[PDB]
Amino acid sequence: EDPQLLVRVRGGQLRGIRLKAPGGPVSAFLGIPFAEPPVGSRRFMPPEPKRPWSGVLDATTFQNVCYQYVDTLYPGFEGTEMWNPNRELSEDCLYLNVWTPYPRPASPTPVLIWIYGGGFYSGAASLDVYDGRFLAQVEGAVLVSMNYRVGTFGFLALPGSREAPGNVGLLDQRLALQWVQENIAAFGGDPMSVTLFGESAGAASVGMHILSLPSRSLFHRAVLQSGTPNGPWATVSAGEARRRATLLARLVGCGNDTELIACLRTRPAQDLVDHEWHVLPQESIFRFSFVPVVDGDFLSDTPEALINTGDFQDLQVLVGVVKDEGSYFLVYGVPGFSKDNESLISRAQFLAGVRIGVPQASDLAAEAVVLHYTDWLHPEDPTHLRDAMSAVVGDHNVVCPVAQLAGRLAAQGARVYAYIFEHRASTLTWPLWMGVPHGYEIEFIFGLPLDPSLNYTTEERIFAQRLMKYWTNFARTGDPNDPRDSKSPQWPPYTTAAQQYVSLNLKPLEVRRGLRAQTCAFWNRFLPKLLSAT
Template identity: 45%
Template sequence: PDRRCTAASPGFDIRSNHLIGPLLTEYPLELSLIKGHLQVSYGIVTAFLGIPYAEPPVGALRFQKPIPHQPWSHVLEASSFGNACHQPPLTGYPESDTWTPKMPQSEDCLSLNIWVPHPQPNGTAPILVWIHGGGFFSGAASLDIYDGRFLAATGKVIVASMNYRLGALGFLSLPPAAPGNVGLWDQRLALRWLWDNAAAFGGDPAHFILAGQGAGAASVGFHLLSPGSRPLFTSAVLMSGAPNAPWAWISLEEAKERGQKLGQQLGCSNDNSTALVGCLQGQEPGEFPKHEFSILNRKKQLGLPFVPTPDGDFLPDTPPRLLQAEHGQPMPIVAGFTANEGSYILLFAAPRFNLENASSIGWEEVLQMVRLIAPGAPEEAVQAVALRYSQDGEEQGEARYRWVMEQILGDYFIVCPVAEMARREAKAGSPVYTYHFAHRTSGLSTPEWMGVPQGSEVPYLFGTLASVGGGNHTEAEEALSRKVMHYANFSPRRNYIAVQQALQLRLSPTRGRCGARTASSMNAASGSGATAASGGQKSEPQPFCSRMYFLWGQNFFEWPGLQNSTRSKSSSLGQSGAHGAAGGTQTGVQNG
């Protein structure tokens, strides 16, 4: 039968076939795909694609907080994805097609997508809301790798995703004319829309999972830290990203400086922020991505130009201070990372190194890399960090120092911030589960030395292995994907211990100083993971725990002279002074 869903703008409630609110207007979402049904391998789902949740942020609305979309007075055709938000092209690197949106780019890009299991649940289905990654400058909810139909059918969970403004259009901060963080405000408005209208799709507002990868995971973290967002979801999944990461935020002063530099690039030089923003609102939207990365100076080579900032509104304080402060209501949290988080960063942030020729990378190149992530560090600290990582080498021979460089970058930009976030949330009372994804997908076009790069677990969560590696995946990988999809149905009401035993993933609450590095490991070859420390269980020490603590905890950043140069903006969490860091060039963190 034909299926239609009546949906409301944010702030309106849905009751069966009519809208309760100031405007008693009916506007069903009609699907054209097999009368609203989409047949997939593991079942049937109903897809609602390209639903606008905000007014187009154009003209005077550019750089401003999103405005809820007005109710529709007609049938809304929701059978195709909405436009992608403006972003630079991603070319010249392995698997670039996987992370490149196919939809046209436009400022009118604020839409969301919903996949509902069939038959429609009776109001008890969990809702997983996905925030895509892309370093806050690229990506879209319409990517094939994020197709929610397989997860909805297999996990019996309602899957939703949204686009949000990127780059300067989403994160320019020149208050009061441009308040900043409007990309995060976009996400919150979409989350509010889904929360208000969950019942219309058979979802349970008391079972809301907010999940993301890379910049999407950092966004989930920002919502955890924002008093206005945390009440809108009940559990969280952070994959390879955290709000306290050195690439995920910059100070308000740095944000203003970058906004002024961008204005100069676009012929809008003006010390008055109101006049500058007015000039920038008159520029063609496609011009912004062309100039955003040119504002970074050489010291910020490992940097992203426009990212969230503590604005005193969405983020009342810096992420490190918010993490240390009193938290909101505790909630279940899953956080984790892949085995080689630093490989993409190394590939594109370090063009000076000949990475394919391992013999060309030695001790001196490692020292250069440490100096790059910690400018101003005393030489004895640089030497100590390089030596500490070299002692752990999993690779021997010519490839040893390339591995060391990749591990330093991965720990500094991804793993250590995730571990710190997990530790802080666990200390505040949240049950925190961690994972370590260690399987390299078959058929990947990335060089073998890159191992299990960032984003490797995403197609396993969504069941979209066909979108990567030419679709040449194995039965063991399909089995692993089914396990990961099942654990996505993450609920504070669920008997999670039973799920662990059934799926043999054995995710366990984080314990100990090392945080996420005591994680369970997911690998298609073994089919199960080693149990992390939990309660009376015993776990073997991880060889990299001490080196992580050395880099991120209380060793590296205690060297005299380093505190003032690299810790001035980050209190006691060991953040680098290059607080835009991660990824490097505009292609360097494509799935970050």
């Protein structure tokens, strides 16, 4: 019985497992319940804290993945499968994971909390690319990740009703954060230094914790990778959430709010997932059926209203995007695209794909987009059209949303560091044309190249160490810069005046100004005036 693996939290005793990382052992505690199983009558409802337990709870194993849609576009292809659930699916899924160094830290140690993405319809903390052992071993960090309910189970809402008020998936995350405040000190964690980081939908969630006051006393710093709470996909209005929820009930055969949610509770999990996609208003990509809702509760107003007016004086944030944000999505709806060919498109297919990548666009707004992205030197050239299609999706959904957030935060007192990630993995399985797709910086942040058996290059390994350093230095201090290291060029704060950001890749840090400034001005400043002239 290893006493390093024995921990007492407020709910009872836990037994963890000693895992081997390349540089040494780490203490892992996997499958720790933080809520009562949100099953039966608890479906669609806010989570409740986990009841105390007897004896020693076995926390040596990953728990079940929250019930969710499992992707089928490319069956058995490692590029898509690496994101699919690697455990059994269950509604009973509210568990978190903790990695610490072995032996347990003597001094209180900065805490990183990871929130996965997956469009708020999917994801799990058990995925191999979320393995916290590397950051724990190498950087001596304490790393936490939770499962939260996705899809209908986490975000279906009849706004204003008591039995489906919406945003419960976000409340799951909030509860896990409270759990860290109450318990992390027992793992050697510092509850007075908690950094949230997340990617895509996870970055958006982190964003919403910034914007929801009850979450604010539970963390001190934030990192948003390729996702924002603002933007076209991360939230819906109370009106639209209600429409979709009502439609889904209709598709599965279902006080009218009360009776409707009751019939839904009798439905087998897979029955809801079966029709989950059928409630989107238009044919689209980068749109998800059940996402956070502007309830006037978790989110008092829209994310844009909130960032446009909020006071972010004592906040420190690290934000960024990968080089080819939109490429991944094209194969998932835009005719002409595939991972099995170069995806060279005609002008016709480019026009058609623009109504899909910008589903909310009027005829005139989509005309504006097509005219902005066409290279008038090569207006017909297939390679340019394919690359521009991908840029439209990435800019509309990620890059410009990010630029807007970085800008509003910086102006209103927040401390901001911005990056773009430009290194394509040598082990990447998607075709060359997709470039550096949405989500492929993650494996580097988490330290995976340090595992010899993954066959990353030495340079990639050296690079992963650099990134773990930036992230953890940022966690320690709110500044990704090494504190006593001179040489290695400095990473400056993003500001509204100078708009400085850096490129993360194999070469030394390079400072650039303006994050797609002209193009984002088009999305962030002009288009809203246009669509509002409809």
